């Protein structure tokens, strides 16, 4: 009668950067979806929350990361932008829910919290659920960069620099994306 480790994901003291977003595989456990899902941004896709306690799934993937407030709208199916195309992409037929909450009291420092990073440049768009942690010098021109930060050769990652004095559109938001997978296999993650 193992209980699903949702506390470890939502109540983690430190979250991952969006470009290197973390995923927790949850399987073979009992979950209190209804009791854990009752100032939170909550959007579900392809499935209803009042019905999750009645469904079993093959695997439930828990993706967690941090973006700024103006970018939460991109964590959704069929969205475009720097976060959706280059950091964390959700498929068009995504079945799951997205949860976000303002974490300005946890992830913002007076001198600036430059620890959280995001990808700015990439040659192509990310596939759904793709994670690219490569930090190779991006070639924006014709000449080969060869690991040289120069003209048309820039570093592909930048910092959020979360400061508490910023506006809500620039304040940190911790995002937890729960994917509900139902392939073949046996259904082990049942709600109760």
């Amino acid at each position, epitope marked *: 009668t193992n209980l699903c480790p949702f506390d470890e994901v939502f109540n983690a003291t430190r979250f991952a950067s969006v470009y290197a977003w973390n995923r927790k595989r949850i399987s073979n456990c009992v979950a209190d979806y209804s009791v854990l899902y009752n100032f939170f941004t909550f959007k579900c896709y392809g499935v209803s929350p009042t019905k999750l306690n009645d469904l079993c799934f093959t695997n439930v993937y828990a993706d967690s990361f941090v973006i700024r407030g103006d970018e939460v709208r991109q964590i959704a199916p069929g969205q475009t932008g720097n976060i959706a195309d280059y950091n964390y992409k959700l498929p068009d037929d995504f079945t799951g829910c997205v949860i976000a909450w303002n974490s300005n009291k946890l992830d913002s420092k007076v001198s600036g919290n430059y620890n959280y990073l995001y990808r700015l440049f990439r040659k192509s768009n990310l596939k759904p659920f793709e994670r690219d942690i490569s*930090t190779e*010098i991006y070639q*924006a021109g014709n000449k080969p960069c*060869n*690991g*040289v*930060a*120069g*003209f*048309n*050769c*820039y*570093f592909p*990652l930048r910092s959020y620099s979360f400061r508490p004095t910023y506006g809500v559109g620039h304040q940190p938001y911790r995002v937890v994306v729960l994917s509900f997978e139902l392939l073949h296999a046996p259904a082990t993650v049942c709600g109760k």
Partner: antibody
Amino acid sequence: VQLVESGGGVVQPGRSLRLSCAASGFTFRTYAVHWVRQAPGKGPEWVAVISYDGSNKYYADSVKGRFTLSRDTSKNTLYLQMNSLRAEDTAVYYCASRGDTVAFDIWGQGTMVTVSS
Amino acid sequence: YELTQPPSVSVSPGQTARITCSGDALPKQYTYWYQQKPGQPPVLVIYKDSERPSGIPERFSGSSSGTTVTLTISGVQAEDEADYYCQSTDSSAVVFGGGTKLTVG
């Protein structure tokens, strides 16, 4: 961002010298590093560049096979081994980071190397 | 390949200073300008012909006209006295101009 050069001084022709740049205020372990010099009365001249891990180095024909650029990310310091120095190498050498907007980002105050005898 | 700038320019306080930099490759290469005061490393004051770094006074501006670029300082101040270097690249497989001493009695 702070770039403190050192190791600059007098050196006779044919001898060697080792400059050092001590970076601070940014993850020096992810950015690329530059060396630039400027001889007295002359214009700016790019010397060398290194990648984030020290694997790829690129020089200028004026210094190829005579200079060597290296780094020690643990000590957060950038090196420039100058072997067989000629009088043309007498210049004010700057180290430089990697920050642009769309290659130069931040320059050090520079140390002076005098090749005389 | 070489960039050509005048060795010296003088202006009175409050006038507009102009420093030119010429080169055959400037039409389709960007130019950059650096200020250098004694004992100090250079400081970028204009990039990509006419863009100003966010910490530089807005009296600094840049313009491009073919093979000549110009650094303009409007309402010049005593603290703007410095050496100024233009910089670009050749149009083939980085170059600095020779510097201009700007005197602001």
